[PDB]
């Protein structure tokens, strides 16, 4: 999926309830591969320090 | 023709000069006729991101339902 339109799609299903994670991420907005290339991550890579709150929206 | 602005003191010396007086001001004078020759003042303003963050026609409240 990486480097295709599928890297943006996280699939769910109607399976019975499970306690295992659907996805996992580390809060390293400038370095985590999944965050480093977003508009936010791109800007953070032109600076050495960051501070503040973030928000994740899921559709 | 001197412009006197004040600095935003970061690290403070154990002086009262570090907290007040002309000691926390800086002076500027333009020597050239063309504005292009000028340095950048750096006393730059900000604005509302709304034109990008919420370019919506019918304004909506976050507490209120977006899809109404």
């Amino acid at each position: 999926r990486k480097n295709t339109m599928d890297m943006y799609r996280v699939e769910l299903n109607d399976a019975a309830h499970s306690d295992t994670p659907i996805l996992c991420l580390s809060l390293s907005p400038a370095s985590d591969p999944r965050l480093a290339h977003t508009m936010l991550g791109e800007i953070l890579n032109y600076y050495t320090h960051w501070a503040g709150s973030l928000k994740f929206t899921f559709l | 023709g001197a412009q006197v602005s004040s600095q935003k003191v970061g690290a403070h010396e154990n002086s009262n000069r570090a907290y007040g007086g002309s000691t926390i001001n800086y002076t500027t004078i333009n020597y050239y006729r063309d504005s292009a020759s000028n340095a950048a003042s750096k006393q730059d303003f900000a604005q509302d991101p709304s034109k990008f963050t919420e370019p919506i026609k019918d304004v909506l409240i976050k507490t209120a339902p977006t899809l109404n």
């Binding site: 050495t48 | 970061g10 403070h12």
Partner: protein, 272 residues
């Protein structure tokens, strides 16, 4: 940075007030002055403590590094920014646990022909680029990183007065820590010993980044070497929590010791 109090004349005493007696167990120091234990005259004090202020104590440019480049990968060098590569400034800073100040960096650049009778070169220009932790580090003396579109660079022409720049208080904490009794990681139960292990007393692996130095001129087959001596002076100084000074030789970036553990000489108890 001010005046000292005058000595007031003091005569004889025969009283129940005994300032000479005390009890140091309390953790306090007895604030006696000469007139408490002897007869004194009036002296108008004119001496001041102007030169022992925290500011005046540090108001000197101290050498923190000697970066060397051989213009014949040595065509460029990288120095990890620190104050612990030298001992003199380090020992003075360590009289305190925390500090907060601005920095002034002055660069003294020297160069010379390695050969007494060979080679020749035109005047050299140096580029001192600051690489903040995260920015790409140069792989060659002439790769794309030297474009410095965002990194601050200083171009020095050989023979010109020493270059000098000022840096603000850049710490990510409210003060610089001269001592950090901790780790950057906490090993968790269950993980391999290789896991969660970090250096004692170390914070970030890359605290302040580093300096990349190179000669901009095209290198000639001539054998030349240059040295950039970095001098730093803390200005607008504030310090917290005094500590006893280093008594034995430094042994690394930590408080580790190994060699000169017996600093004091012998002297007779009853010998003046």
């Amino acid at each position: 940075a001010n005046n000292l109090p005058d000595t007031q004349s003091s005569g004889p005493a025969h009283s129940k007030e005994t300032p000479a007696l005390t009890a140091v167990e309390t953790g306090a120091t007895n604030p006696l002055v000469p007139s408490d234990t002897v007869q004194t005259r009036h002296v108008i004090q004119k001496r001041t403590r102007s030169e022992s202020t925290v500011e005046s104590f540090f108001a000197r440019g101290a050498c923190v590094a000697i970066i060397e480049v051989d213009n014949d990968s040595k065509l460029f060098s990288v120095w990890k920014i620190t104050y612990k590569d030298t001992v003199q400034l380090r020992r003075k800073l360590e009289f305190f646990t925390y500090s907060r100040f601005d920095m002034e960096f002055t660069f003294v650049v020297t160069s010379n022909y390695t050969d007494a009778n060979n080679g020749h070169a035109l005047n050299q220009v140096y580029q001192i680029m600051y690489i903040p932790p995260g920015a790409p580090i140069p792989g060659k003396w002439n790769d794309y990183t030297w474009q410095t579109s965002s990194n601050p660079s200083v171009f020095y022409t050989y023979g010109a007065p020493p270059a000098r720049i000022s840096v603000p208080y850049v710490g990510i904490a409210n003060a610089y820590s001269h001592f950090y009794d901790g780790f950057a990681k906490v090993p968790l139960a269950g993980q391999a010993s290789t896991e969660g292990d970090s250096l004692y007393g170390a914070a970030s692996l890359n605290d302040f980044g580093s300096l990349a130095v190179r000669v901009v001129n095209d290198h000639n087959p001539t054998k030349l070497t240059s040295k950039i001596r970095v001098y730093m002076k803390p200005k607008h100084v504030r310090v917290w929590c005094p500590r006893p000074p280093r008594a034995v030789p430094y042994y690394g970036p930590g408080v580790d010791y190994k060699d000169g553990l017996a600093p004091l000489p012998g002297k007779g108890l009853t010998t003046y």
